[PDB]
Design a protein around this ligand. Structure first.
Ligand code: 5SP
Ligand code: 5SP
Ligand code: FE2
Ligand code: FE2
Lengths: 220, 221
């Protein structure tokens, strides 16, 4: 039950379609699409209009996990749903009312993800863990790709896996073949990887390696 | 002195390099790149990281006109300059001190654009017109492509042309083979056109049509 979702942050953003196509053709389980509004984080990536074009290019079948690093996650729920996103992962730090937002995401037919930044206590998630589909434990400060993996986040992952056996747990930031085992042994089952996968001639082998390390570690 | 800059807002954003390349090959004078942060306008497009990738794909020749529909234009000046943008067009309504921002843009080596929304009186643009390279008169409410041209904006263009004869004046929003006449006769010499060029089977001829109409008006003056 371990899935690999490449991030395209450090890809050729002038050719997102081709970049994502290579990922899917290489056996990626899903695509992790980083949406930044220049406000919640100090960078701007793209929003629902790019997602709409991607969905048209990539077809109906691929799974889009939207990492919504935006200050008003309430605003982009319908636009993302209409564009064809499968999962809407908002930041607990950004919402005025998590309960209302979770409901709205579900009314819009999308799965619900909830992300926390490194400095955010994992216990902030407790009241919500039973209402969401996936918790995203950031392992770098959000805003940029290619940052250093924060191993000190692993106790958050372990705590979530122990307290909520059924919850999908995603890690995001500096995850690659060097750090994936740490994530898997802590309890993560959804693995975002960007820079580590993006340069490869044979992304399929790297993706398979991440997935296999993660699955065998989970089998324990 | 008339120039046509297609907008790629309603293009295939998953294939943005390809869309820009074919605009350039079709004779575009420049590329007009719409940057929206979801705050200044209710939509999000892309920012400096996409510009960087485009500059790498297109090379150093093409001119990028950055339409900065962002609420903190001060924040993105350096990042856009580093990404390879040529001109930074910010909104008058998006800053408390346009004078300081204008200075910072030039210090970062870029050309300076200054834009006003339809609801914003052209009078407020005037104090800065002698300090900028290009004034942008919006002819639709910013945030979305394919909207209807607001011909009621033409007196803004005409007034700027009269008061600032050497100023480059851009119009943006619903400009096409029909409405370009109004823009040209009013005094605009820089034409942004999105849906009219992008959804055309013959972008070259559309671009030629827009430039020719504008030149004819430019000559008459
Ligand atoms: O959300 C983010 C950054 O804000 C992550 O998705 C990064 O894009 C992960 O990329 P690498 O750290 O694997 O390069
Ligand atoms: O800045 C904008 C919209 O905010 C323009 O650049 C749009 O791209 C309008 O293009 P048209 O499709 O109306 O020509
Ligand atoms: Fe992410
Ligand atoms: Fe524009």
């Amino acid at each position: 039950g371990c899935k690999i979702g490449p991030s395209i942050l450090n890809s050729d953003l002038a050719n997102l379609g081709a970049e994502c196509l290579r990922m899917l053709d290489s056996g990626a389980d899903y695509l992790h699409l980083d949406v930044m509004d220049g406000h919640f984080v100090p960078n701007i990536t793209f929003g629902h209009p790019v997602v709409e074009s991607l969905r048209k290019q990539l077809g109906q079948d691929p799974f889009f996990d939207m990492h919504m690093m935006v200050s008003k996650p309430e605003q982009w729920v319908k636009p993302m749903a209409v564009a064809g996103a499968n999962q809407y992962t908002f930041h607990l730090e950004a919402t005025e009312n998590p309960g209302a937002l979770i409901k709205d995401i579900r009314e819009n037919g999308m799965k619900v993800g909830l992300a926390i930044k490194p400095g955010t206590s994992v216990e902030y998630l407790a009241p919500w863990a039973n209402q969401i589909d996936m918790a995203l434990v950031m392992t770098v400060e959000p805003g940029f790709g290619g940052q250093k993996f924060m191993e000190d986040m692993m106790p958050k992952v372990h705590w979530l896996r122990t307290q909520f056996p059924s919850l999908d747990i995603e890690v995001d930031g500096g995850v690659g073949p060097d750090t994936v085992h740490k994530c898997a042994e802590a309890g993560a089952n959804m693995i975002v990887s960007g820079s580590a996968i993006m340069r490869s001639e044979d992304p399929r082998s790297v993706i398979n390696l991440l997935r296999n390390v993660c699955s065998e570690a989970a089998q324990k």
